[model samples]
Target: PTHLSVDTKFKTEGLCVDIPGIPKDMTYRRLISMMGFKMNYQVNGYPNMFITREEAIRHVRAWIGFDVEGCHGTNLPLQLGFSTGVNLVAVPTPLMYKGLPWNVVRIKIVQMLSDTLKNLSDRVVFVLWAHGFELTSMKYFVKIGPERTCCLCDRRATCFSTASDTYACWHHSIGFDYVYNPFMIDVQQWGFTGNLQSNHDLYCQVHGNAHVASCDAIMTRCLAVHECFVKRVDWTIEYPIIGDELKINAACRKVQHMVVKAALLADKFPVLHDIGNPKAIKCVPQADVEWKFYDAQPCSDKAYKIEELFYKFTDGVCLFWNCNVDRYPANSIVCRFDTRVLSNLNLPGCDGGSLYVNKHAFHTPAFDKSAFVNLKQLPFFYYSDSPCESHGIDYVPLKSATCITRCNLGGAVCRHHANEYRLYLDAYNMMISAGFSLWVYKQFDTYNLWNTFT
Candidate 1:
């Protein structure tokens, strides 16, 4: 129904590496944070990019409004829904959860972010009611970050977009043909009042389903139309400009370009089972070799350990890895991982978190597919998110939970829990995304597949 095409004449064969591979000893906390994972990166340094009414209509073909639902308390994204006027897409179709009539999210939520992101069009204006949390969640699935997008930054808590290159105009000349970042009409910022369900009922002539991502998206789109086009405040207030238009455009181009290439890898649609334990291979090998994925389960127990630690410390808050408050309590989480754990691992890693490149990523200097904390194999597409039920072990790991060592990706059900189903699903999501499986397994089970492993 919607198409976001790319013109890749200038795009060369080897502009950048496809996946630089996750760093060794890379804790899930830092990786998750790097992917936004609810961490806020406000666009305040630059003034909002304002567009005139005349230009707005001329340039915008569709105003894409979207909403992501999830357990805010748990920071688990439930569903993502977006609409570009006539088109609507939902990751899980049926939402993972619908809470507080508005508080909702699920693995399905993450999938929506993927579907929305992996596809784009320059003619559309992308938006959200309140941006930060939704944006953060979207980032988690898409794997686009300053470190992944820019050439100058090392990614060590140093995103050029926020700190060094605050203005997007410097990148203005770059422009965008592919889709990347989105936002111009933050409905809330621009006087989008009344509750979501009320607007859904009133505007769209629908009721309840307030927390439904797709429903919320439709309401958002209609509300934006009412505020910007119909009422015609003849004012900039109702229809505000997107923040840092030029750089924002450039950011989109840069990010979209990366994914387009990554999409090629997706085209391959492969199933591998060789990306061995993190203990054996923490990074990519120094020599050139035809790549083949290991059994595709995490190697290091630390991978799962780190994931659990993040959930524990952050408890779904966006404040896990900060360093301003002198490390006492302020930076305890960050400090502990770095000093107590990450330091000893002494693995080669990127401060920027996940890495995506053209092909040079294969040209690494350390570790092999089995041990290094690298992605081990090409990333599974969906590239953003997938269905929640699909996240289960039988679906995600593409098999049962069988990490040779113990657990994979920060202990995703490696140890048993009251809810084995959910944990298995969660582990699947973590595994395919970054080549890390999160599980919890305290003991062996007499039932399930554990009968053999035990």
Candidate 2:
């Protein structure tokens, strides 16, 4: 080891201070000059904790395999060795040596690996769904061990939850054993690769419980995501319209009107008391002559038949109709009265083009004997306020959907029938008028005799 002699003098203010006990071979001025570049002879607030250049060098050498027996510390008491440098000196430096037990390092590495896997798994499965990828499934393979169990009741349990947090409680399963104090092992199984297993001897190994349990959890989660996906599709409502209109709103309105009318009609009859109001409608069935055709009244034991059921009478005829008649016994002759409400009537909108009814006809292609070939085309556009030209096309009698008919309240049957047939004829003429028109240009692929002469 390189050491500075004690017999050294540091010149200060032209006065030399001798460093006592140093070797005579060392020069005082040379040792004092070297001290300026060496480690401080004192640490913060501790003068005795000082290390000279020679002592610091000796301590460093001792740490790197140089034999320095009886040197509990360097000549400079403050000089520190490698082990003590970290534990005692409190200096920040990267560890360069490795002599810690394998178990300690292994546990730390396994914990880090487990946490990383959990973070990745959450992103791949849960985060994808949150971002609208429609997560189909997510599976997790968890580690199980002999130490896993319930703590309080001392019963075998897989997982445990407290008021604040939840974790795997393995202590209850197996009594405290020094060999398996930290039972959480990292290893791999099935198609998944990770630190989810541990090394154990025959007497302590819990067979393959850890592997099997993890596989089951992962598979179960996958199946659950699949099942949830199917259910979502099944309940999804694609097109909420029926026949180009939402039916629920229309049905609800019709029901409300029926309910009100039933109650009003019930009051006049001796069998029906004053039960036209909302509250009274509830006790409607109890009335002797209850009007039960009201649409809003749900079918129940309290429900009973009504005198005038408009829906049954009209069937498919009209949208809304409510009519009633009453008779009194006071007069020998029947004193009857009628009530008709037209709220349910279906009237066409102001626009006349509201209805679009399509009809078709099928026939053979024989031109001569075909019934469709001999019909005469009638001109109907002239009747309109705006006079129109004959649609530009030659009329050819073809087998098409053109038989017409008319519906009138009261009219000459022949006149109405003729007009209907004319309507059909006009339709066919319109289609024929728009038929394809052909225009052709002649092309010469070879030189003619006239070209050869020129």
Candidate 3:
């Protein structure tokens, strides 16, 4: 992916040192080997390059293995799932080409091993890998707007700075206090072209006396921090159910149980081992809350009849039944009825019913079999606000437990719980992504690997 090229003739016979029996007709291969050994020794007291193709492949395989093994007990698929979904970001082109440009050696490798990489395309179900600058070049790959040139914002990235010893966009240093002083400069006070002393101070502050360097380190740190901040901010606003400890706890518990049951059922799918750990599931409090409270009322005889018919047809199913505060006629003593049940019953005054299922229904105390599966597919019926208001019933349905378990199994042991499964899944992905970021950071650090070209 790099545009730079090395001089073959110079590499072959450029040096003429006072060494005994040194051949003037040395080949490029010999020259590379000698230089690789010397550079390795100079940097890390080793006789080998930082990473060979074989070593790179081995490291990649090791990371994939660890990730796959981590999901061994989960229901995630093998290939398309997170296990094999490796995303290689900003893998240094210099390291891949061994101090040479990719274009110069691309055809030679392809001719030798076309089939090996032929399947590595976006259309194929393979791991994701790519190379680019952390900010500028990556913008094209991620399809960001051209106006938004900076990694953190739409402003143009004109100045250079760093989080550590390396090159980074100066705009990032504005809010970060640690990058203040020498590394960060006020644009108005010190433009891109500044005095030698100021420039040297900025360099010292950025590098901290590190002799070796690469732009990759600065890019990696900036990318990782930006990614983390974006994800955290999204997570903070994603959850809208919170406050009213009693209600939140009830909903969380219900979703948690539903997820746990699903995991257990998934274990019976004829796999080598259970795919999920039921014990890992837990209830997390909601981050936002908007609740509407109302008093409960007695169920009318007509409402009882409708409930009986629904129970008969639905196999006496109830999920958060008593938990709903709006499951009654507006200010009247009548239990809310599922529109589906009411429609099927064909009861007087129930014609053209707008309500269907009550989201807050908890349990059918009378039913012996309640365990259900396929909760997402189950039909949830509810009346619209207009009909409820016209019928003098509560216009709004109280937010209640979101039971995800479908009632398919007769007298089964399945349970319904809160929406904690989403939180668990989010946390899982975040950890994996963080792990990948750390690996990239280490790979791009010049000091971490001996004889790193870039």
On TM-score, the candidate that comes out on top is 1
Query: TM-score of every model?
Result: 0.27, 0.12, 0.18
Better of 1 and 2 by TM-score: 1
Model 2 misplaced regions, further than 4 Å: 1-142, 146-148, 154-156, 159-226, 232-454
Candidate 2 lDDT (Cα, 0 to 1): 0.22
The alpha-carbon deviation from the true structure for residue 437 of candidate 2, after best TM-score superposition, in angstroms, is 65
**Per-residue CA lDDT of candidate 3, range 201-275, in tens?**
432233221211122222222222222221121211221111232443444344334332232232221211111
**Model 2 C-alpha lDDT per residue in residues 319-352, reported as the tens digit of each score:** 1111111211111111000101111111111111
Error of 3 at 402 (Å): 4.1
Worst 10 residues of 2 by lDDT: 129-138
Among all candidates shown, the one with the greatest lDDT? 1
Query: Sorted by TM-score, highest first, which candidate order results?
Result: 1, 3, 2
- The local lDDT score (0 to 100) that residue 222 gets in candidate 3 is 21
For each candidate in the order shown, give its overall lDDT on alpha carbons: 0.31, 0.22, 0.22
